[model samples]
Target: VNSFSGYLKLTDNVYIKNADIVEEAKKVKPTVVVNAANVYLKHGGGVAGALNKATNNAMQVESDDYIATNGPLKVGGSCVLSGHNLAKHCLHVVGPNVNKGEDIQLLKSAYENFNQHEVLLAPLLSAGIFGADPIHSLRVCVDTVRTNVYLAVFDKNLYDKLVSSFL
Candidate 1:
């Protein structure tokens, strides 16, 4: 089934979608897909792993190459990689690891660094294993982004909560 359930408009340009990012990327063919990556840019698990699988693991190979050449991305840092299948490019950002005392500004900086693009597919930074609360992560994403982007959420209940609070 098509997992793209619905979306909520956030700003004149930004929106939130209850969808799988990898699936949305294939359908929307956005200008870039943002990966909430670690400093190493390894596509081993989480959203990174799913995106890597969607691209037939080409994303991981490019990520490996990028790290080998440019070294690890610092927290709040980002890098662009050529997208092998759905989107034109991939932007990998190292979001704050709140468990280690990284703060909101670091997460906000990650979004701020995403330069202008017509369309972006992004996840809620630090909302997963890194442990930032869903509401806070969604708030940060909505507050920082101004372009036509979809902040995709994989969890339906979480999506509902975000919509209830933010909308």
Candidate 2:
């Protein structure tokens, strides 16, 4: 059972699971993980804090061009951070910022922007401190992401809410 709880299969092998994000973080070796980042790619906040720390904050040196030319990252864009950690790359995208509800366009845009992959281990995008609707965000994630998704779901209550919504 995924986030859909069998109500739907938005995409094959899309999983919505509950556990520590950092725990799943280690399991997806050489994987591409998505971090819910600010436009700045600032370290020491949310998921970026952990992933940033893992890579020794190496993203700054590598992604400056992407940042200078095409970003403050955005709702519908992504930049890749390579090297360090067990993961080969980290796909960083800007999601809803403290919106406290569904930002359907933002979530969908971020999902749409992802093109490359290995096994993906992403946290629940903007469904945490940003307060994006878990169901909406997860649906877009499942629908658009190209690889098998292992979502690091830190919020079980949100997961339960999504289950009830599906029910």
Candidate 3:
């Protein structure tokens, strides 16, 4: 049931990408939801880039409601620091300083503390970290998290795991 790799195996009758989270959530109506945290905040586009294009104008706050109001969401600022309100429960895992030990503890704690479900969506890495390379950050993210991670990568070639883990 669990695919540690990038590829997802499902019945032909099942559609993956087309499935809508809001609608699906409405059906199962899960009591709790958890969202990952942002790693980059001090520089680059930051949360503005991480958030969906529609919510870019809003300011970054500790809650989605705050971001809905302010303009340019803060990368790893209050929202992630506090937790992602978009979901019932959110986990904010801060990656390493681009060096040193694997930052899996934060993610593990989030999942354990929140008791996350099997199916969850998480952003690629610190995609919006100012002055940092997306590819490098992604590698770090992949090596750090010990869960069934789903990476949203812009560059397919850079994601070696996608090939090794998926098709």
lDDT of 1 by residue, 1-167 (tens): 22333567777766787888888889877778898898998788888999999989888888888889989988998988886797888888889978768775788888776656666788998887778997987877777876666789898899888888884
Give candidate 3 misplaced runs (Cα > 4 Å): 1-48, 62-91, 99-115, 126-149, 160-162, 165-167
Question: What tens-digit string does per-residue lDDT give for candidate 2 at 112-133?
Answer: 6554664666776777777776
- Lowest summed-lDDT stretch of 10 residues in model 3? 9-18
lDDT of each: 0.81, 0.65, 0.35
lDDT, candidate 3, equals 0.35
How much does candidate 2 score in TM-score? 0.75
Error of 2 at 7 (Å): 17
The candidate 1 region of ten consecutive residues with least summed lDDT is 1-10
Order the numbered candidates by TM-score, best leading: 1, 2, 3
lDDT, ranked from best to worst: 1, 2, 3
User: What are the per-residue Cα lDDT tens digits for candidate 3 across 1-167?
Assistant: 53323333222211122233333333333333223333333222333334322223232334445435553333332233322223343344333223323343333233232223344444434333323454444444444434444333434454444434431
* Model 1: residue 87 alpha-carbon error in angstroms: 0.5
TM-score of every model versus the real structure: 0.90, 0.75, 0.38
Model 1, residue 148: C-alpha shift (Å) = 1.8
Residue 36 error, candidate 3, Å: 6.6
- On lDDT, the leading prediction is 1
Candidate 1 structure lDDT: 0.81
